Amino acid sequence: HWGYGKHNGPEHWHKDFPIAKGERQSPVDIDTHTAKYDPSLKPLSVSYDQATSLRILNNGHAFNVEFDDSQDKAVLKGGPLDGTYRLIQFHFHWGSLDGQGSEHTVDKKKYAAELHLVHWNTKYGDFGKAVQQPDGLAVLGIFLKVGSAKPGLQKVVDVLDSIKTKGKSADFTNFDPRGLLPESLDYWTYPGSLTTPPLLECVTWIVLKEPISVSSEQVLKFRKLNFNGEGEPEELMVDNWRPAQPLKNRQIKASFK
Numbered sequence: 001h002w003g004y005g006k007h008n009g010p011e012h013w014h015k016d017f018p019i020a021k022g023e024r025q026s027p028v029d030i031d032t033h034t035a036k037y038d039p040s041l042k043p044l045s046v047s048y049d050q051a052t053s054l055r056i057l058n059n060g061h062a063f064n065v066e067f068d069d070s071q072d073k074a075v076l077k078g079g080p081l082d083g084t085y086r087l088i089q090f091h092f093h094w095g096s097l098d099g100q101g102s103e104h105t106v107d108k109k110k111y112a113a114e115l116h117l118v119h120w121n122t123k124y125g126d127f128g129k130a131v132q133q134p135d136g137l138a139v140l141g142i143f144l145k146v147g148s149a150k151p152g153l154q155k156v157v158d159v160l161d162s163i164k165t166k167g168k169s170a171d172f173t174n175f176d177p178r179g180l181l182p183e184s185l186d187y188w189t190y191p192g193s194l195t196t197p198p199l200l201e202c203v204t205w206i207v208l209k210e211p212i213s214v215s216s217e218q219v220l221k222f223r224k225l226n227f228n229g230e231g232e233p234e235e236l237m238v239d240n241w242r243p244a245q246p247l248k249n250r251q252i253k254a255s256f257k
């Protein structure tokens with residue numbers, strides 16, 4: 001089954017998921033000089049004050065923090081988006097070393113990690129129907145660099161010891177995702193895909209320009225997670241990122257001049 005190793009990683013995914021070679025795959029390199037400021041982009045609106053987190057799960061590929069999405073609690077609106085997109089989960093991608101780990105790159109620069117806040121378009125009723133639509137999803141991507149600790153991340157770091165292996169979960173109520181955001185909401189946007197199988201081309205990507213800083217100790221704890229299940233040989237959960245894919249017939253737009 002798919003993963004990030006030499007025998008099941010990104011270069012192999014196309015055999016089971018032919019869309020891997022499609023026309024709007026993600027991630028991409030963001031060439032900052034070619035991206036064009038779009039004065040038509042409406043203001044972006046991140047409304048996370050009523051977010052209701054539920055649980056944290058090691059799914060064998062990353063860890064997901066899951067939210068109650070049965071009502072408009074935590075939503076993303078504005079920017080390139082029409083209507084309202086509900087937060088369903090967030091997760092990260094990260095490296096074995098601080099010099100890699102992000103999926104998107106900025107003028108070919110790799111960050112140490114990348115946070116994905118995944119949202120679905122409420123016009124389609126449920127996530128499963130949304131991922132059959134070209135405008136079904138919006139993912140807010142945030143780069144992580146190593147420097148000072150991010151206080152709003154520490155509650156995540158401290159629960160990781162309880163979900164070390166694939167299939168383990170833990171209660172994760174009362175987590176506030178506002179604590180994961182940088183100061184600025186300046187962003188780049190483009191149409192793309194999920195970056196893990198099934199690689200569905202449903203996503204409006206919104207990638208923030210400003211990274212958050214996390215401490216070396218915080219990212220080191222990500223790297224102590226395991227891809228394997230309990231009782232199986234230990235394989236550290238590191239380098240769970242897909243590299244940049246061809247931009248093809250797309251333009252990246254900037255919200256800022």
Ligand SMILES: NS(=O)(=O)/N=C1\NCc2ccccc2N1
Pocket residue numbers: 116118139193194195196197198
């Ligand atoms: N890295 S990503 O683009 O968020 N990929 C994702 N997100 C959420 C999801 C849900 C179900 C199946 C696959 C995926 N893949």
Ligand SMILES: [Zn+2]
Pocket residue numbers: 091092093116195
């Ligand atoms: Zn992701």
